[PDB]
mmCIF file as Biopython writes it, N, C-alpha, C and O atoms, coordinates in Angstrom:
data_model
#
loop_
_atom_site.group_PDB
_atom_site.id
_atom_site.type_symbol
_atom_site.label_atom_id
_atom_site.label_alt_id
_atom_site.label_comp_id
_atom_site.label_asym_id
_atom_site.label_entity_id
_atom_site.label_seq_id
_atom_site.pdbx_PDB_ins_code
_atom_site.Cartn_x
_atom_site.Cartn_y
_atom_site.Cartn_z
_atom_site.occupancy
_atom_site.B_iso_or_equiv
_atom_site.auth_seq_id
_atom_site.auth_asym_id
_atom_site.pdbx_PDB_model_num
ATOM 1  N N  . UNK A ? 1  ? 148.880 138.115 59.321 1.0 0.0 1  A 1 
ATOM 2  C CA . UNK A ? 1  ? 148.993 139.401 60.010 1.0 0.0 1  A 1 
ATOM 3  C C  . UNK A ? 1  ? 147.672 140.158 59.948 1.0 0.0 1  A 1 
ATOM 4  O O  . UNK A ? 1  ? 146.630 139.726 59.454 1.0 0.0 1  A 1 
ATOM 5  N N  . UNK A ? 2  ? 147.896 141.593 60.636 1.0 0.0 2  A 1 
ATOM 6  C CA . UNK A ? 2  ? 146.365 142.165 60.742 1.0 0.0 2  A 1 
ATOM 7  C C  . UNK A ? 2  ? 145.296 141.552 61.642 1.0 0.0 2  A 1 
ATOM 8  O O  . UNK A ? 2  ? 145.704 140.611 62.322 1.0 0.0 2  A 1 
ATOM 9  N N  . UNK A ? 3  ? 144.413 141.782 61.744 1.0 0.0 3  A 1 
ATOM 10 C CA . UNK A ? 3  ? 143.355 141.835 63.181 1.0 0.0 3  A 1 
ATOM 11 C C  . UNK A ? 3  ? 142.647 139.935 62.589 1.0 0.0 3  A 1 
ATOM 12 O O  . UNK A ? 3  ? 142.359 139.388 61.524 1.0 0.0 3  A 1 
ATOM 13 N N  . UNK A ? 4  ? 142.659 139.657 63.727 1.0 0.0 4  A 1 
ATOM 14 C CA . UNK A ? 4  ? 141.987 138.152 63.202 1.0 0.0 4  A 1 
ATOM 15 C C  . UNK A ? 4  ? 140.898 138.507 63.708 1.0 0.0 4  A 1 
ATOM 16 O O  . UNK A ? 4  ? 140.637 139.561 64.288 1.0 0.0 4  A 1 
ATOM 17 N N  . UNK A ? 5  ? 140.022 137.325 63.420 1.0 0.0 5  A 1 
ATOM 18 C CA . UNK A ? 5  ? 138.372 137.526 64.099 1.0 0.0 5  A 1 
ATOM 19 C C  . UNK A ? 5  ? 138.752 136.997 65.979 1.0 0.0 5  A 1 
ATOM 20 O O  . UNK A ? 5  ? 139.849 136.845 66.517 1.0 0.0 5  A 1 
ATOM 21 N N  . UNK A ? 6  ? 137.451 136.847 66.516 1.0 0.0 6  A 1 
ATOM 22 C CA . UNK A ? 6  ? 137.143 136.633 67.995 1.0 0.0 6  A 1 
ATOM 23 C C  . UNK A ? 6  ? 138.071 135.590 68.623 1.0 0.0 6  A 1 
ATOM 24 O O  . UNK A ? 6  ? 137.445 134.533 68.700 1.0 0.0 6  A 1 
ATOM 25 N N  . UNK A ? 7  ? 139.499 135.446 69.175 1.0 0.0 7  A 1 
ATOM 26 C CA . UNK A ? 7  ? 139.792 135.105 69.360 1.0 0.0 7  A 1 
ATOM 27 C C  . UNK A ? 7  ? 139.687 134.518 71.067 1.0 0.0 7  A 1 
ATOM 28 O O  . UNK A ? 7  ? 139.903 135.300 71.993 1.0 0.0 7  A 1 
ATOM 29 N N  . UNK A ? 8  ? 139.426 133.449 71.243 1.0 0.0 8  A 1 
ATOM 30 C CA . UNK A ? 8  ? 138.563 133.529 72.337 1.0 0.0 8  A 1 
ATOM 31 C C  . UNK A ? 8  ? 139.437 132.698 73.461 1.0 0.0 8  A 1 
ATOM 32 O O  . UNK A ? 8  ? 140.454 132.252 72.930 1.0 0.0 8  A 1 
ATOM 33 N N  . UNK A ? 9  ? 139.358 132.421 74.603 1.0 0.0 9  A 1 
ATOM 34 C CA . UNK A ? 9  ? 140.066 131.994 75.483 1.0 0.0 9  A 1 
ATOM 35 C C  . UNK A ? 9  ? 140.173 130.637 75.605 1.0 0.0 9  A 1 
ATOM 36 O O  . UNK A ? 9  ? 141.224 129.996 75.584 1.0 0.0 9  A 1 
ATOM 37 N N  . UNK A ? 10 ? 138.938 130.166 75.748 1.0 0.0 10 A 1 
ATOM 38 C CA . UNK A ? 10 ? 138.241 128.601 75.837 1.0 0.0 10 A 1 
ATOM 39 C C  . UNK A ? 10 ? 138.853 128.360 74.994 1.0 0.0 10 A 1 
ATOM 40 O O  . UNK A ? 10 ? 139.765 127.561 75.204 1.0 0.0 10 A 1 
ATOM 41 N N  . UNK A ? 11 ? 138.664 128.973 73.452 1.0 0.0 11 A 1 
ATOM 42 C CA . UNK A ? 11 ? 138.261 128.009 71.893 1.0 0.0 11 A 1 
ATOM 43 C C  . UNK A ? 11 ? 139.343 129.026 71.395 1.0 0.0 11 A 1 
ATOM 44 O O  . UNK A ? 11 ? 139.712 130.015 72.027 1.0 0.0 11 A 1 
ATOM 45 N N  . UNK A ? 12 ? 139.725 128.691 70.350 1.0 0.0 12 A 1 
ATOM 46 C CA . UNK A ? 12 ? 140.329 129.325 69.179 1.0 0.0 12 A 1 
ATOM 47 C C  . UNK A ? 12 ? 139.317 130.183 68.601 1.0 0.0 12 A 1 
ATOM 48 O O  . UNK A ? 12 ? 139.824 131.255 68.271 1.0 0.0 12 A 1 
ATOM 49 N N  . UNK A ? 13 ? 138.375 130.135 68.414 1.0 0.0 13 A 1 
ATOM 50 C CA . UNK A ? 13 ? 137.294 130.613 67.705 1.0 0.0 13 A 1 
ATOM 51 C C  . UNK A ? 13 ? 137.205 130.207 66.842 1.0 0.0 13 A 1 
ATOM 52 O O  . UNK A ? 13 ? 136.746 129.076 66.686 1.0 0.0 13 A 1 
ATOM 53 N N  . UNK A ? 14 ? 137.534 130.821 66.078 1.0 0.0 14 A 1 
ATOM 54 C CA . UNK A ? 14 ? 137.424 130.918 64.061 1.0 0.0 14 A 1 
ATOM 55 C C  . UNK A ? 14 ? 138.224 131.401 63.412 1.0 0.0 14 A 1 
ATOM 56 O O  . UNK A ? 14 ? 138.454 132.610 63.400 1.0 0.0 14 A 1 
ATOM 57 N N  . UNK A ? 15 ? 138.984 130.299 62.543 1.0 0.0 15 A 1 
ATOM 58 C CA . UNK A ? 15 ? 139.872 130.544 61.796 1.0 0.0 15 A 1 
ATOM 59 C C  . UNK A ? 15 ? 139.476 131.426 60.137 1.0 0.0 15 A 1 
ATOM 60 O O  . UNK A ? 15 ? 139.233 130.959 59.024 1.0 0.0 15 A 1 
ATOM 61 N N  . UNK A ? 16 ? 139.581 133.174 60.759 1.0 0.0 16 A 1 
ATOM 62 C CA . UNK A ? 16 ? 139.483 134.039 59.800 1.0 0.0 16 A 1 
ATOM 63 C C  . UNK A ? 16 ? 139.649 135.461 60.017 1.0 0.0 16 A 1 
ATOM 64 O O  . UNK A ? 16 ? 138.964 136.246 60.673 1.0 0.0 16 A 1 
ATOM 65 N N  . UNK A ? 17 ? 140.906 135.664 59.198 1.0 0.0 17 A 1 
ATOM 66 C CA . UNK A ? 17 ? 141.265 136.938 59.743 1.0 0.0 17 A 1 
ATOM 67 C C  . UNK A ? 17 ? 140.431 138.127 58.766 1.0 0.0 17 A 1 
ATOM 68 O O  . UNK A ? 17 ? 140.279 138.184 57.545 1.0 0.0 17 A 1 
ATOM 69 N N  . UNK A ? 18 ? 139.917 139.145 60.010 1.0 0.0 18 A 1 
ATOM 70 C CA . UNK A ? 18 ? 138.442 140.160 60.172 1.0 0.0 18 A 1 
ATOM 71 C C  . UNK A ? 18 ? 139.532 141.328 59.199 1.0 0.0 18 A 1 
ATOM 72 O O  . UNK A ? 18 ? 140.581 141.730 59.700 1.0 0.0 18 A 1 
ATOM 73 N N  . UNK A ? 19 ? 139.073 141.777 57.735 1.0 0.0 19 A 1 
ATOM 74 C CA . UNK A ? 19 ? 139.201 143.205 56.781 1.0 0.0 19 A 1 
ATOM 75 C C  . UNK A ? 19 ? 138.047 143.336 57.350 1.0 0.0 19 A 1 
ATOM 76 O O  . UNK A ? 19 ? 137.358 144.331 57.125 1.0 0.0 19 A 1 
#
């Protein structure tokens, strides 16, 4: 839960959710 990082359209991005 809470804000994840850059979740992006193409890609998943990066698995790490952004404190």
């Amino acid at each position: 839960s809470g804000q994840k990082g850059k979740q992006q359209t193409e890609s998943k991005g990066s698995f790490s959710i952004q404190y």
